[PDB]
Amino acid sequence: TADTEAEDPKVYEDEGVKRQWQSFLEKGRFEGGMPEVPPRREWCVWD
Amino acid sequence: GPHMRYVEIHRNLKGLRKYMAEQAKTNLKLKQRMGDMRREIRKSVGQLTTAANKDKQQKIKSILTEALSNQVESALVDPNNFVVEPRKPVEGATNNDPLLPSIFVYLINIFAKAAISQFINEAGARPETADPVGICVAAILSEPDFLWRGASLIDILIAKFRIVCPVLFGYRGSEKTEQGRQRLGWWKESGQWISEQQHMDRMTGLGAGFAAISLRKFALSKKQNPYPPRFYWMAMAKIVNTPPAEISNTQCVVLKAMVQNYEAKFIEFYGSAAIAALRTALIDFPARAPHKSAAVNSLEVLAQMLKRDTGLDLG
């Protein structure tokens, strides 16, 4: 549910937060560090 | 870092202890009962460690319900002094009154102290014992009876984690300097620093305790999670993102206690993102550490077990 995500869903619209997650969404791993903002539920789905 | 309000709550809670002692002089109904109420909470918390054992959690709930009714005629206090964010009256909330009985906030504070001490004294030597405590903390503080304006009073407990385990909140330091040992929460018994083993034992119990409260699943419950798993995620990220030059063994010990015995729960919540995170915490972070130690090795050992179980490969 919303417990695992940031309490404010609007944060995922920030470009800064997109950059933190760009490495995980593209390459599966964290290249530039672990994002301080937790992921969206859909990003954690097994492919 | 650098610093925030969670310390301010710690001071107000210290001032609340004196307030209850002063009332006990004039208030006889408070003196008669307050002491026994304090002890039965600590006793019930200690017993949690040692399957359908629900009689110890109810004894703690019944005492807090009794303190909320305030038969002891205790003075009322402003709960905004014990929460990070001042709260406004919430629609549909069970308690929007601006003040609360001082005995309630006090016994809530004793419940928080009791859980912290259990993490320190028992979970430091046997990390398994932190989980049943965390269950109790989340169960009690989430009861609608104890929600002040729609939210729990968990900030009383988190403020203590900030004092005894600052690394969970982004604080760093060198274990070689006194300014750093303070910033890492290295304790002092009688002026001088405690032994390195007692420090790392504290960090182990507090790290396991933090995971016990931050990795609870509430979707089956009708109650709202007082400290949802997003706080476990943020805490881990602040530690693993530490630049290599500033890593300390204190960080590695807490991180190990955060992960060991909580890998499954972490993966259930965050799935493929948890694997990526565990890769950062158990592979990249130990490799970034400036000096090897039993703490760094323990992480690498966990990395191998998870690499076998999960493959630690999403690519």
Author numbering:
A (entry chain B): 510 to 556
B (entry chain A): 212 to 261, 265 to 311, 312B, 313 to 529
Article excerpt on this structure:
Both human and C. thermophilum Nup42GBM adopt the same fold as S. cerevisiae Nup42GBM and recognize the same surface on Gle1CTD, with the critical hydrophobic residues nearly universally conserved. Similarly, C. thermophilum Gle1CTD•Nup42GBM undergoes minimal conformational changes upon IP6 binding, which are mostly limited to a loop directly adjacent to the IP6 pocket. The interaction between C. thermophilum Gle1CTD•Nup42GBM and Dbp5 also required IP6, consistent with the evolutionary conservation of the IP6 binding residues among fungi.
DDX19 is a member of the DEAD-box helicase family, which are RNA-dependent ATPases composed of two RecA domains (referred to as DDX19NTD and DDX19CTD throughout the text). Gle1CTD plays an important organizational role by providing spatially separated binding sites for Nup42GBM and the DEAD-box helicase DDX19/scDbp5. A comprehensive structure-function analysis of DDX19 indicates that binding of Gle1CTD•Nup42GBM induces a conformational change in DDX19, thereby stimulating its ATPase activity.
